[PDB]
Amino acid sequence: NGKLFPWAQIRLPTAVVPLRYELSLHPNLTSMTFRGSVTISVQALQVTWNIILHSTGHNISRVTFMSAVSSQEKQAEILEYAYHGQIAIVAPEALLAGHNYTLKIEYSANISSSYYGFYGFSYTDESNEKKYFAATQFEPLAARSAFPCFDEPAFKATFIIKIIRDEQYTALSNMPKKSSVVLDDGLVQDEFSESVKMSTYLVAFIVGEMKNLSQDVNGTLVSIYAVPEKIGQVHYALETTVKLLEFFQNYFEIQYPLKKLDLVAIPDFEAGAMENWGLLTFREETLLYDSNTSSMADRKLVTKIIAHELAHQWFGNLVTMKWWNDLWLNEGFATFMEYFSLEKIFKELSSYEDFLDARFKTMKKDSLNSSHPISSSVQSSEQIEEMFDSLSYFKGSSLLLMLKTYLSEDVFQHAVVLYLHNHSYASIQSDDLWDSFNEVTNQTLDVKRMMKTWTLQKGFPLVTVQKKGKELFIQQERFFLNMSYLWHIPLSYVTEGRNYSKYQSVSLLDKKSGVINLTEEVLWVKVNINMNGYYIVHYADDDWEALIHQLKINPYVLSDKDRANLINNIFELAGLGKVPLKRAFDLINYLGNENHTAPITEALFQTDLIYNLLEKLGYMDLASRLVTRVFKLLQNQIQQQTWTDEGTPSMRELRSALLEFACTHNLGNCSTTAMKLFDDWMASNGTQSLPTDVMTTVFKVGAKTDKGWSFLLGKYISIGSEAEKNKILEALASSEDVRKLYWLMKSSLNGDNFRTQKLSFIIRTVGRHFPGHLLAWDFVKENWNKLVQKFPLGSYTIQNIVAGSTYLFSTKTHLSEVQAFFENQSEATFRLRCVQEALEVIQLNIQWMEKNLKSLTWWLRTETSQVAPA
Ligand SMILES: *[C@@H]1O[C@H](CO)[C@@H](O[C@@H]2O[C@H](CO)[C@@H](O[C@@H]3O[C@H](CO[C@H]4O[C@H](CO)[C@@H](O)[C@H](O)[C@@H]4O)[C@@H](O)[C@H](O[C@H]4O[C@H](CO)[C@@H](O)[C@H](O)[C@@H]4O)[C@@H]3O)[C@H](O)[C@H]2NC(C)=O)[C@H](O)[C@H]1NC(C)=O
Ligand SMILES: *[C@@H]1O[C@H](CO)[C@@H](O[C@@H]2O[C@H](CO)[C@@H](O[C@@H]3O[C@H](CO[C@H]4O[C@H](CO)[C@@H](O)[C@H](O)[C@@H]4O)[C@@H](O)[C@H](O[C@H]4O[C@H](CO)[C@@H](O)[C@H](O)[C@@H]4O)[C@@H]3O)[C@H](O)[C@H]2NC(C)=O)[C@H](O)[C@H]1NC(C)=O
Ligand SMILES: *[C@@H]1O[C@H](CO)[C@@H](O[C@@H]2O[C@H](CO)[C@@H](O[C@@H]3O[C@H](CO)[C@@H](O)[C@H](O[C@H]4O[C@H](CO)[C@@H](O)[C@H](O)[C@@H]4O)[C@@H]3O)[C@H](O)[C@H]2NC(C)=O)[C@H](O)[C@H]1NC(C)=O
Ligand SMILES: NC(=O)[C@H](Cc1ccccc1)NC(=O)[C@H](CC(c1ccccc1)c1ccccc1)CP(=O)(O)[C@@H](N)CCc1ccccc1
Ligand SMILES: *[C@@H]1O[C@H](CO)[C@@H](O[C@@H]2O[C@H](CO)[C@@H](O[C@@H]3O[C@H](CO)[C@@H](O)[C@H](O)[C@@H]3O)[C@H](O)[C@H]2NC(C)=O)[C@H](O)[C@H]1NC(C)=O
Ligand SMILES: *[C@@H]1O[C@H](CO)[C@@H](O[C@@H]2O[C@H](CO)[C@@H](O[C@@H]3O[C@H](CO)[C@@H](O)[C@H](O)[C@@H]3O)[C@H](O)[C@H]2NC(C)=O)[C@H](O)[C@H]1NC(C)=O
Ligand SMILES: *[C@@H]1O[C@H](CO)[C@@H](O[C@@H]2O[C@H](CO)[C@@H](O[C@@H]3O[C@H](CO)[C@@H](O)[C@H](O)[C@@H]3O)[C@H](O)[C@H]2NC(C)=O)[C@H](O)[C@H]1NC(C)=O
Ligand SMILES: *[C@@H]1O[C@H](CO)[C@@H](O[C@@H]2O[C@H](CO)[C@@H](O)[C@H](O)[C@H]2NC(C)=O)[C@H](O)[C@H]1NC(C)=O
Ligand SMILES: *[C@@H]1O[C@H](CO)[C@@H](O[C@@H]2O[C@H](CO)[C@@H](O)[C@H](O)[C@H]2NC(C)=O)[C@H](O)[C@H]1NC(C)=O
Ligand SMILES: *[C@@H]1O[C@H](CO)[C@@H](O[C@@H]2O[C@H](CO)[C@@H](O)[C@H](O)[C@H]2NC(C)=O)[C@H](O)[C@H]1NC(C)=O
Ligand SMILES: *[C@@H]1O[C@H](CO)[C@@H](O[C@@H]2O[C@H](CO)[C@@H](O)[C@H](O)[C@H]2NC(C)=O)[C@H](O)[C@H]1NC(C)=O
Ligand SMILES: *[C@@H]1O[C@H](CO)[C@@H](O)[C@H](O)[C@H]1NC(C)=O
Ligand SMILES: *[C@@H]1O[C@H](CO)[C@@H](O)[C@H](O)[C@H]1NC(C)=O
Ligand SMILES: *[C@@H]1O[C@H](CO)[C@@H](O)[C@H](O)[C@H]1NC(C)=O
Ligand SMILES: *[C@@H]1O[C@H](CO)[C@@H](O)[C@H](O)[C@H]1NC(C)=O
Ligand SMILES: [Br-]
Ligand SMILES: [Br-]
Ligand SMILES: [Br-]
Ligand SMILES: [Br-]
Ligand SMILES: [Br-]
Ligand SMILES: [Br-]
Ligand SMILES: [Br-]
Ligand SMILES: [Br-]
Ligand SMILES: [Br-]
Ligand SMILES: [Br-]
Ligand SMILES: [Br-]
Ligand SMILES: [Br-]
Ligand SMILES: [Br-]
Ligand SMILES: [Zn+2]
């Protein structure tokens, strides 16, 4: 490319840093263009002739350069290097160390039609009037497409934003609006206060018609914004935000430093949310809430995501990673605080179940060979994007969970408060976090050397346990399936002596192996309590047998988390090969006596995975026998379920999980009950309320008919609750009619009836069942370039689409097909982690069948199929 561009690396030089930006913009939402002026106050730290900077998609009309002393307005030369998104201003005289200069760039651009950058869209009223909207989504690398800037997290500065807007529209930004000035035509010029020192990826602005619901919290004005038709649905978000804000301010011991806090429901938005200082943005479906149209799950989603964005105000905004290799310092911490804060002041939501489920999934991902270390180098935009995955979020927060469990809660909070004070308005890398722990630790434990392997090595240990009399023999090794270094592991363990008293302790495995002294003789022992540790445990056969026998005798000597753990671990170990798959089904035979959600949903997960693998291979009979077996196992919990909203949140989640399992596979007469409810709902023009906990199920069953499908579509394009629309959309995309499934995907990719923000979800849903299995993948291939135009390589959305439409493939023939497809895209695309993980998941699918197919075929030989065999 550009050997004639005065910079080669992807990280900007350190020679010049920005102090202040004054950015004034004139967006035209109608024509979808904008004109701009950016003034950048910089300082040189070394002698240099070049200012290297970021800019993309900018038609640059004038570039002036002012020596601060000299105050005369020069012209300066400009070079471009599109590959790295970089531009270079070559200076008339050399920049001297410690001198100040002002850089002014005038330019015009397009308002983006993706979800990335400064983007804009139109939506439709209840009034059937067309409305326009513009919003920013900059993280990680899009700020540079709205304005020239030093677009790297470590270059923090202050921003003065100016927006020209039509009088009817409201403009928002990070800071409070300082003033307005009326302009010719129906135009207003807005000016926002100078911001605090922050990263460019956090700059945000919004132009559109909105209303607000507000409340004072001790000098901070908290406001929820939404389009006027929706403003009735923001009361729960406001009440929640106020609670979590007080909580976080008490815990961190550092006040939120802005005079305003805005939370905005954006009509069209790809992420779940974004933490821009003072102007947090959300999908409508993740911030709006109505008790009568939104399920329990929907309420949890809104509480969780608000906790998450609020936590970012400290971890991410106040304190920020130096570079994307340490993204987990943001996202791990924010995820940890999300689930921590809910357990403190929303304990009734049982959000710990979600945390637990997400970790199960992150481990399966982490166990692959195409995993990276959680802190790993990123040297391209694709790798930067790829950091936004479940490792950085859920492994990062489970590292912290391990650490908090092992030290104390108070020792943890002390470390945290030191950390945020010491690095306020500044940048960090992994070592600073361990340093802050070391200061509180009293060098009793060297936390830096304890966390070394956890942060720099991929994967996690398999811990093997064998009871030799009154002592546990213990080993660690890399967990992975084939086709290094030691962890410092906090081994917790709980146990029951011969006299039925329970003892629990903690030791720390530093070496390859160790012995634990048990003090007594024990009936059973369970390692890794509540899965507070990020590893999997394998027992010797005698010791598996003891836990499996105790579950059959009285499962409640362990927690629901403990029993969920065991179910997960034994299935992942039967997949590797360390135990026969039969052993896993022995362990879940106790489920007839299980009343907690977490172990039941974890078993329902493994069952469905296996079911869906067999179904796509065409082993229909065998797959029906499998869910019949599991159905008989849970027959009593399933049959005692009511079709209501009664019970604790957790019990409400169990109802949904159980009824959904029975209706999907046509077991019992749940289908009949659901259809009766749908017909009565449909014949009442959606008036006779459906209990929010059974809607998805009822809608799925109705959508299996033309008459019902059409009627649901009619509701989707017209009702005002985005929560209900989402349950409807899931039903539509569960139709067995291929023409309809094709229409849903094509419509969403174009906008039209469904927004493109629903596309990954629609494709996910279509690819999961048999009629749409081949259709989703084909859709992804044929529209591959249009997808990448809307969602760059290799962002979260694309990795979601690739994974969700390939992970149920289990033959060599599909493996070759998927591989060949990506190799014809480009060698760069085929070498993406996204692609490599998909190829690896398929290979594992293939090995899984060749190990367990004949086993499963034998175990189920007497069970009754539901389908006729071919
Ligand atoms: C099955 O159930 C669905 C509900 O899902 C019903 O759909 C509703 O149908 C009604 C009646 O057609 C719709 O009401 C109409 O809304 C329009 C938009 O209203 C907005 O804009 C006005 C000003 O523009 C605001 O005042 C208002 O508060 C909203 O912000 C109105 O413009 C329409 O008004 C015109 O017609 C009525 C006569 O019906 C006159 O009184 C008015 O003065 C004016 O002439 C009208 O009010 C409503 O939008 C639909 N809701 C949804 C969610 O789609 C179906 O009607 C129902 N089917 C059957 C057979 O009953
Ligand atoms: C309701 O609202 C009020 C105001 O918003 C809150 O009261 C404020 O509490 C904060 C934090 O506790 C105070 O800000 C801090 O004051 C501490 C001391 O500053 C005083 O003392 C110094 C000592 O030199 C005096 O010179 C000075 O005049 C101040 O009056 C500081 O130690 C604080 O810590 C640090 O500042 C930043 C904050 O993170 C760090 O980077 C530094 O390391 C430094 O240590 C901070 O400056 C504030 O002054 C209080 N206001 C009032 C009016 O008392 C309530 O806490 C709040 N209640 C809620 C939210 O529940
Ligand atoms: C971007 O460029 C577009 C043109 O490509 C330009 O579009 C026009 O914007 C104005 C916005 O002010 C619109 O004018 C309105 O017209 C309606 C009638 O359709 C009026 O009701 C509007 O409101 C009031 O006018 C005064 C207050 O503004 C009041 O005295 C009066 O009582 C009304 O309440 C307003 O006059 C016009 O419709 C559009 N045209 C198109 C084709 O979209 C837009 O202004 C440019 N934006 C920027 C920021 O440069
Ligand atoms: N949900 C999303 O699409 C993205 C991407 C993602 C998805 C899964 C795992 C990791 C990351 N995440 C976000 O929007 C989370 C919330 C989400 C979530 C929280 C924890 C773990 C996983 C997801 C969420 C969703 C529902 C309820 C509560 C929180 C919001 P954020 O503030 O992190 C923001 N920094 C993401 C910016 C971004 C997103 C995707 C691509 C590029 C840039
Ligand atoms: C280059 O420009 C930067 C700012 O763009 C200069 O740094 C800062 O300059 C201001 C002076 O205006 C210092 O702020 C303070 O003023 C307020 C009164 O409002 C008071 O609170 C402070 O005690 C200080 O007087 C600021 O601290 C300063 N920062 C640094 C690191 O120096 C910088 O001086 C300029 N360099 C030049 C012109 O060589
Ligand atoms: C605020 O955080 C800074 C980091 O910006 C802390 O400075 C760091 O202090 C730790 C000690 O706790 C240093 O660790 C030591 O480094 C030496 C140098 O190689 C090493 O040989 C030792 O074994 C030990 O690990 C760390 O290097 C240092 N880092 C930097 C960048 O200075 C500082 O302690 C914190 N301040 C407060 C008041 O807590
Ligand atoms: C789910 O099912 C389990 C087992 O059916 C329930 O655990 C049972 O809980 C009751 C009361 O919570 C226990 O009875 C009590 O035992 C303690 C200790 O001996 C004593 O202090 C009380 O006076 C009473 O006797 C019972 O032992 C326990 N069963 C087992 C096997 O541990 C659990 O409550 C159910 N959960 C829900 C949400 O329904
Ligand atoms: C980039 O924008 C510039 C102006 O900002 C466009 O150049 C011309 O503008 C002058 C007046 O400033 C007119 O004399 C010309 O008519 C404009 N150009 C044309 C082709 O009409 C320039 O065209 C834009 N560049 C690109 C590549 O679109
Ligand atoms: C919407 O926001 C405004 C502030 O932006 C809220 O009320 C304001 O209160 C302050 C102080 O009393 C005043 O500076 C503003 O003039 C007030 N605005 C209005 C419109 O009254 C207002 O309450 C918020 N709306 C809702 C429904 O909460
Ligand atoms: C059950 O037996 C255990 C040991 O076999 C008893 O626990 C020990 O009690 C002694 C004192 O009697 C303590 O010094 C030990 O520390 C205890 N062991 C542990 C592991 O804590 C226990 O008291 C007995 N309980 C009953 C109800 O019989
Ligand atoms: C059709 O399904 C419903 C499930 O809701 C059956 O009603 C329940 O039946 C089981 C088993 O007899 C009981 O344990 C439940 O308590 C019943 N009612 C509830 C939970 O409300 C119904 O009996 C089924 N149809 C037939 C013919 O048996
Ligand atoms: C905006 O998009 C149009 C589409 O063809 C293009 O011609 C124009 O040059 C673009 N402006 C930019 C990239 O600044
Ligand atoms: C939802 O329903 C309950 C009772 O059915 C009611 O008290 C509540 O007000 C309803 N929610 C709204 C927003 O009306
Ligand atoms: C696993 O990936 C590493 C790079 O992390 C690579 O060197 C190695 O060849 C791969 N091994 C297998 C078995 O896939
Ligand atoms: C284990 O601990 C018990 C009591 O705590 C002690 O009597 C016993 O000797 C210990 N075993 C070993 C091998 O140290
Ligand atoms: Br301007
Ligand atoms: Br109107
Ligand atoms: Br972009
Ligand atoms: Br927690
Ligand atoms: Br790096
Ligand atoms: Br880059
Ligand atoms: Br522990
Ligand atoms: Br049933
Ligand atoms: Br259609
Ligand atoms: Br068509
Ligand atoms: Br599998
Ligand atoms: Br048998
Ligand atoms: Br078959
Ligand atoms: Zn986050």
Coordinates of N, CA and C and ligand atoms in Angstrom, one line a residue, residues 212-214 221, ligand 9:
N212 N -38.7 13.4 27.6 CA -37.8 12.9 28.7 C -38.6 12.7 30.0
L213 N -38.2 11.8 30.8 CA -38.7 11.6 32.1 C -37.5 11.8 33.1
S214 N -37.6 12.7 34.0 CA -36.4 13.1 34.8 C -36.6 13.1 36.3
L221 N -29.0 15.4 37.5 CA -30.2 15.2 36.8 C -30.2 13.9 35.9
Ligands
LIG9 C1 -37.6 17.0 31.1 O1 -36.4 17.7 31.4 C2 -36.6 19.0 32.1 C3 -35.2 19.5 32.3 O2 -34.5 19.4 31.1 C4 -37.4 18.8 33.4 O3 -37.9 19.9 34.1 C5 -37.1 21.1 34.2 O4 -36.8 21.5 35.5 C6 -35.7 22.5 35.5 C7 -35.6 22.9 36.9 O5 -36.9 23.0 37.6 C8 -35.9 23.7 34.5 O6 -34.6 24.2 34.3 C9 -36.6 23.3 33.2 O7 -37.2 24.5 32.6 C10 -37.7 22.3 33.4 N1 -38.3 21.8 32.2 C11 -39.6 21.7 31.9 C12 -40.0 21.3 30.6 O8 -40.4 22.0 32.8 C13 -38.7 18.0 33.1 O9 -39.4 17.7 34.3 C14 -38.4 16.7 32.3 N2 -39.7 16.1 32.0 C15 -40.2 15.2 32.7 C16 -41.6 14.6 32.2 O10 -39.7 14.7 33.7

